Amino acid sequence: SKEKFERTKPHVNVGTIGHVDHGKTTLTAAITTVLAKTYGGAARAFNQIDNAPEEKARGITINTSHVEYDTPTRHYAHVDCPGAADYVKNMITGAAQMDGAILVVAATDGPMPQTREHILLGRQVGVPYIIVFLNKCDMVDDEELLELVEMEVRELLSQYDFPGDDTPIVRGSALKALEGDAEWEAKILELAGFLDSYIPEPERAIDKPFLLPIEDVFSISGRGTVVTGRVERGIIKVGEEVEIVGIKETQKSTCTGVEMFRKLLDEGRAGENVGVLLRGIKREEIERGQVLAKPGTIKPHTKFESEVYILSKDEGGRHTPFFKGYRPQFYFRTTDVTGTIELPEGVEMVMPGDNIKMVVTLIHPIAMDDGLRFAIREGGRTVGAGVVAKVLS
RNA sequence: GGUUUAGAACGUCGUGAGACAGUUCGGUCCCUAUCUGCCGUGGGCGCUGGAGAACUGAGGGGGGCUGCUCCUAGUACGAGA
Ligand SMILES: Nc1nc2c(ncn2[C@@H]2O[C@H](COP(=O)(O)OP(=O)(O)OP(=O)(O)O)[C@@H](O)[C@H]2O)c(=O)[nH]1
Ligand SMILES: [Mg+2]
Ligand SMILES: [Mg+2]
Ligand SMILES: [Mg+2]
Ligand SMILES: [Mg+2]
Ligand SMILES: [Mg+2]
Numbered sequence: 001s002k003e004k005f006e007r008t009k010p011h012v013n014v015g016t017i018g019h020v021d022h023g024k025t026t027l028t029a030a031i032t033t034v035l036a037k038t039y040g041g042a043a044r045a046f047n048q049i050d051n052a053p054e055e056k057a058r059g060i061t062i063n064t065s066h067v068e069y070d071t072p073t074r075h076y077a078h079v080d081c082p083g084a085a086d087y088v089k090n091m092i093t094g095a096a097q098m099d100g101a102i103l104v105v106a107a108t109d110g111p112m113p114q115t116r117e118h119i120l121l122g123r124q125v126g127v128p129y130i131i132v133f134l135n136k137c138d139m140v141d142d143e144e145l146l147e148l149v150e151m152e153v154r155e156l157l158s159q160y161d162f163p164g165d166d167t168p169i170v171r172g173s174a175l176k177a178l179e180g181d182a183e184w185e186a187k188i189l190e191l192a193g194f195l196d197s198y199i200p201e202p203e204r205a206i207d208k209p210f211l212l213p214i215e216d217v218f219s220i221s222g223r224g225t226v227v228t229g230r231v232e233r234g235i236i237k238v239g240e241e242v243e244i245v246g247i248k249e250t251q252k253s254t255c256t257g258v259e260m261f262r263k264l265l266d267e268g269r270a271g272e273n274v275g276v277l278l279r280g281i282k283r284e285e286i287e288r289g290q291v292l293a294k295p296g297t298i299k300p301h302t303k304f305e306s307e308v309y310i311l312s313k314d315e316g317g318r319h320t321p322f323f324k325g326y327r328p329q330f331y332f333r334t335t336d337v338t339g340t341i342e343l344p345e346g347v348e349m350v351m352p353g354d355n356i357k358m359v360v361t362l363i364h365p366i367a368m369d370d371g372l373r374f375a376i377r378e379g380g381r382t383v384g385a386g387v388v389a390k391v392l393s
Numbered sequence: 394g395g396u397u398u399a400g401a402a403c404g405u406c407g408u409g410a411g412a413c414a415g416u417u418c419g420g421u422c423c424c425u426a427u428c429u430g431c432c433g434u435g436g437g438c439g440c441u442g443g444a445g446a447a448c449u450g451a452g453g454g455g456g457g458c459u460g461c462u463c464c465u466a467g468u469a470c471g472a473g474a
């Protein structure tokens with residue numbers, strides 16, 4: 001919090017997706033040291049991407065860490081996802097703000113169950129674009145074996161409804177690029193080119209009023225409570241009235257500084273991850289799931305009608321009927337919440353793979369409007385996508 | 394230290410002397426090694442003329458224990474941990 005962030009080069013939210021222990025987090029560490037050395041940005045290291053006791057004694061990542069690497073054309077902002085089966089909830093917050101992912105499948109193991117589960121969550125939430133990266137390569141010195149894995153990833157993406165064959169598959173070791181190998185340094189410089197070429201300039205909404213979902217709350221020693229997250233729409237000026245709506249109730253507030261990776265800002269525009277500092281709020285009372293809206297724009301609701309599209313076995317979901325009293329998890333912008341289902345009259349049962357409308361009473365109120373997209377999940381897997389129809393409360 | 398002598402007391406049994414795998418406090422542990430054995434250390438003669446060395450090695454005898462940490466490799470094995 002000292003240097004002013006100059007608004008030059010378009011902002012893009014990138015992040016690594018893939019299987020457990022697959023060079024997902026190590027790729028992010030390779031991207032920093034490669035781009036910092038040649039172009040001449042800020043250095044950083046692989047340690048700062050994941051410290052704590054939880055990501056050292058174990059080794060695995062839980063928290064969605066963030067990184068800022070700059071290139072001549074654009075200014076990227078990384079989101080390193082966790083990857084494991086237990087950490088799907090805090091991943092979806094990292095994956096929702098991500099515009100164009102970098103998928104991570106490896107040349108020794110290949111596509112494994114989580115890779116299918118990750119890309120499934122990317123479609124229903126919001127992941128337009130995706131780039132493959134083979135994160136081992138050197139361990140198996142062979143031309144025939146390494147290229148057989150490329151075929152199966154093209155099959156996976158195309159089977160699940162992505163381009164597949166059009167996606168630029170890249171090969172390169174992360175640990176070799178970390179030290180200083182001229183061939184492998186240049187091969188991950190090539191990935192920075194593939195991010196620039198394939199992913200276009202993202203479409204933001206800097207017109208309709210301010211909204212910002214809170215991904216992770218902080219308490220800065222000196223300033224007060226800081227909320228992070230991508231600004232979904234509108235803008236944020238310093239010393240402007242902001243209403244925090246969602247779980248519990250609703251509180252008034254005012255912004256006292258917006259920032260971009262420990263650098264000051266005047267206007268926090270849409271489509272970019274920013275840390276908003278709120279005035280006169282405690283760490284405990286403000287929680288994860290609430291949204292920073294402009295006063296009057298949005299209202300918290302505990303009941304709503306919604307056109308729910310339930311999935312079948314082929315698309316990946318439930319395979320049995322259910323009656324009123326069923327309680328699955330509804331993932332709106334960031335957080336999840338449980339809610340009882342009340343079906344319409346003249347509908348005895350809800351079969352899998354069917355379009356119907358239904359009233360859903362949530363246990364916690366969340367800020368919502370008509371035409372909001374969500375993805376229902378239960379039992380460590382997906383259930384059904386849909387849209388909000390009418391407000392009731 | 395315990396149990397097992399003489400003192401004393403408690404509970405208990407006995408009219409009592411006393412008694413109790415009931416308890417409680419106090420209460421002499423000798424031996425200079427002949428033989429066998431064993432550990433060492435010599436004298437004597439023998440080994441075929443004597444003497445000084447150096448050995449071979451039949452046959453004994455000691456010795457023989459394991460831990461972590463790193464590397465292999467977060468590799469194989471596992472959705473994962
Ligand atoms: N040979 C090789 N090993 C790698 C590479 N990248 C990572 N590793 C190994 O895997 C670990 C790196 O963590 P990754 O699993 O790649 O990334 P991650 O985000 O921690 O993975 P998740 O647990 O899924 O979050 C290190 O301990 C490395 O030993 C690579 O490019 N080549
Ligand atoms: Mg990860
Ligand atoms: Mg006060
Ligand atoms: Mg005694
Ligand atoms: Mg005694
Ligand atoms: Mg007596």
Ligand SMILES: [Mg+2]
């Ligand atoms: Mg007796």
Ligand SMILES: [Mg+2]
Binds near residue numbers: 414
């Ligand atoms: Mg007795």
Ligand SMILES: [Mg+2]
């Ligand atoms: Mg005693």
Ligand SMILES: [Mg+2]
Binds near residue numbers: 419
């Ligand atoms: Mg005495």
Ligand SMILES: [Mg+2]
């Ligand atoms: Mg004595």
Ligand SMILES: [Mg+2]
């Ligand atoms: Mg004698």
Ligand SMILES: [Mg+2]
């Ligand atoms: Mg003797």
Ligand SMILES: [Mg+2]
Binds near residue numbers: 431
């Ligand atoms: Mg002897």
Ligand SMILES: [Mg+2]
Binds near residue numbers: 439
């Ligand atoms: Mg003789």
Ligand SMILES: [Mg+2]
Binds near residue numbers: 440
């Ligand atoms: Mg002789």
Ligand SMILES: [Mg+2]
């Ligand atoms: Mg002879």
Ligand SMILES: [Mg+2]
């Ligand atoms: Mg011998």
Ligand SMILES: [Mg+2]
């Ligand atoms: Mg003999």
Ligand SMILES: [Mg+2]
């Ligand atoms: Mg022996």
Ligand SMILES: [Mg+2]
């Ligand atoms: Mg040993």
Ligand SMILES: [Mg+2]
């Ligand atoms: Mg190691």
